[PDB]
Design a protein around this ligand. Structure first.
Ligand SMILES: NC(=[NH2+])NCCC[C@H](N)C(=O)O
Ligand code: NA
Ligand SMILES: [Zn+2]
Length: 432
C-alpha cells in the first residue's frame, strides 16, 4: 500500500526503505523539460515486500532489473510497480534498476508552488517540495524515507550542472559533459538539488566546526539581478552559530545556488536552491537551519511541517540574538502578525495548511514558550538531543512531546502542549 500520509495518502509505499539512489540523468537541452534517466535504487524493507512501488509522474520506463536479472514491471498513471521474483524481507537489500525517458510533470494544488522539475530561461532545476521529485526520478516520494544520492548529470558541453553532494569528476565525450556528485548523508527526495544550465561554481574557504570540516561552495547562474550576493564570511558565521545550537552540521559542504528566477528558496541538501528574489539574510539562515530540521530530521507525515518550518523559523531568532538583536522583541513581531490571522493546531489537517502562517510562526513561538519555560541551557541541550534522537528516524509531533516529557519534564511537555493543541493562539510567551 501507500505510506498512508494524512495529507497526501497516495504517495510512497508502506514498509519500503530506499537506502541509496544512483542516478544518471541526461538533459539534452537545459530549459526544456524532456530528459532521460538511468537509476539504480539500493532498497531495504521494514516489512516483507513482494513488489517495489515507486512514484513516477511523467517519464516512461523502458526497462527494469532486480539484482541484475530481468524483472516484471508495469507503469500506472502515477506509479511504477516492479514484481520481484521473491519478496524483499527486513534485513535484505536489493538493486532495482529503471531505465526511463520523457517529460516530467509538475504536481498540482493551486500549495505556494507546483513542485517538480522546473524549466525557465535556459535553466532546468528541481524545486520539488513536497512531492515533485517523482517527476524526474522514480522514487519513494515521502520524507519518511530519506536516502543517499549519487548523481551523474550529462549535459551539452556549453552548459554545466550542479547537484547536492560533493563534486567528484567531470568527463567530456562527443560534445557532452558528465558531472558526478555524491550526497553521502541521507536526505528526503525533495531535498535532492539538481540544476543544469549556465552555472559557475565558486569555492570559498573551508569552515572548521571543532573537529568537523565543512567545505564551502556556491553556484552562480547567469543573469542575476544587481545585488544578488552572498556576503563574505557570512555562511561561516551562520554555520558556527547554528551548529553550536543544534549540534554538528549534518553534511560535508554547504552553499547556495543563486538562480535568476522568481521563486521561493528550498533547502536542497548542502546546496540551497536560492532564487534571487528570495536571497535575504533571514532566508539564507532559514534554509541553512533546514539542513538539520527537514533534511537530517525528516517528517513522518506532511501534517507535521511545523517541525521543519517552525524550527527553521526559530533559528532566525537564534541567529538574530547571536548578532546582538533582541530576541524577545522579534518574537513579539511574530505574535503580532499571527494575532491578526487565524490559528490552528500545529498538526495540519489539509494541504493548504502545511505551509501556512501557523506552520512557521506558531511553530517557532511554540519553541519560544518551551525555551522560556526550561531555560536557555536546558533548551539548547534539548535541541542537541532532539537532533540526535531523530537522526535516522522520522519525527512526529507526538514523538516530540514524548521526548520533551522524557528530557525536560512533564511541566515543559504541558507548556508545549498549549501551543501544539488548541485552535486559538495562546498569549505571547514572555519570561516569567
Ligand atoms: N512558501 C512556501 N511554503 N514554500 C515551501 C517551503 C520552501 C522551503 N522549504 C522554505 O524553507 O521556505
Ligand atoms: Na531510506
Ligand atoms: Zn522553510
Amino acid at each position: 500500500q501507500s505510506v498512508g500520509d494524512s495529507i497526501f495518502p497516495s504517495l510512497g509505499q508502506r514498509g519500503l526503505d530506499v537506502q541509496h539512489y544512483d542516478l544518471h540523468l541526461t538533459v539534452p537541452r537545459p530549459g526544456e523539460p524532456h530528459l532521460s534517466g538511468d537509476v539504480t535504487l539500493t532498497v531495504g524493507a521494514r516489512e516483507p515486500l513482494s513488489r517495489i512501488v515507486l512514484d513516477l509522474l511523467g517519464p516512461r520506463v523502458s526497462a527494469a532489473q532486480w539484482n541484475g536479472q530481468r524483472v516484471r514491471w508495469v507503469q500506472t498513471a502515477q506509479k511504477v510497480e516492479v514484481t520481484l521474483p521473491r519478496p524483499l524481507r527486513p534485513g535484505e537489500t536489493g538493486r532495482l534498476r529503471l531505465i526511463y525517458a520523457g517529460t516530467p510533470e509538475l504536481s498540482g494544488d493551486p500549495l505556494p508552488i507546483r513542485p517538480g522539475w522546473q524549466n525557465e530561461a535556459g535553466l532546468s532545476y528541481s524545486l520539488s517540495e513536497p512531492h515533485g521529485t517523482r517527476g524526474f526520478l522514480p522514487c519513494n516520494d515521502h520524507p519518511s524515507d530519506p536516502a543517499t544520492f549519487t548523481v551523474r548529470v550529462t549535459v551539452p558541453a556549453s552548459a554545466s550542472a550542479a547537484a547536492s553532494g560533493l563534486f567528484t569528476t567531470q568527463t567530456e565525450r562527443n560534445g557532452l559533459k558528465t558531472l558526478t556528485f555524491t550526497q553521502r548523508v541521507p536526505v528526503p527526495t525533495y531535498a535532492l538539488g539538481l540544476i543544469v544550465g549556465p552555472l559557475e561554481r565558486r569555492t570559498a574557504p573551508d569552515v572548521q566546526l571543532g573537529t568537523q570540516t565543512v567545505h564551502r561552495r556556491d553556484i552562480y547562474a547567469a543573469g542575476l539581478p544587481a545585488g544578488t550576493t552572498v556576503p563574505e564570511g557570512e555562511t561561516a558565521r551562520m554555520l558556527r552559530v547554528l551548529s553550536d545550537w543544534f549540534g554538528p552540521y549534518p553534511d560535508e559542504v554547504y552553499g547556495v545556488a543563486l538562480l535568476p528566477v522568481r521563486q521561493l528558496a528550498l533547502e536542497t541538501a548542502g546546496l540551497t536552491t536560492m532564487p534571487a528574489t528570495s536571497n535575504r539574510e533571514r532566508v539564507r539562515l532559514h534554509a541553512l537551519a533546514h539542513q538539520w530540521f527537514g533534511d537530517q530530521v525528516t517528517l513522518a507525515d506532511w501534517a507535521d511541517t511545523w517541525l521543519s518550518e517552525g524550527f527553521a523559523t526559530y533559528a532566525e531568532l537564534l541567529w538574530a540574538e547571536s548578532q546582538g538583536e533582541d530576541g524577545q522583541a522579534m518574537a513579539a513581531d511574530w505574535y503580532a502578525r499571527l494575532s491578526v490571522l487565524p490559528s490552528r493546531p500545529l498538526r495540519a489537517t489539509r494541504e493548504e495548511e502545511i505551509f501556512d502562517a501557523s506552520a512557521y510562526f506558531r511553530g517557532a513561538l511554540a519553541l519560544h514558550a518551551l525555551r522560556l519555560k526550561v531555560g536557555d541551557a536546558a533548551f539548547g541541550q534539548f535541541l542537541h538531543s532532539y537532533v540526535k534522537t531523530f537522526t535516522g528516524r522520522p519525527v512526529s509531533t507526538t514523538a516530540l512531546l514524548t521526548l520533551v516529557k522524557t528530557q525536560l519534564g512533564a511541566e515543559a511537555e504541558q507548556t508545549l502542549r498549549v501551543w501544539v493543541e488548541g485552535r486559538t493562539l495562546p498569549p505571547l510567551p514572555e519570561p516569567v
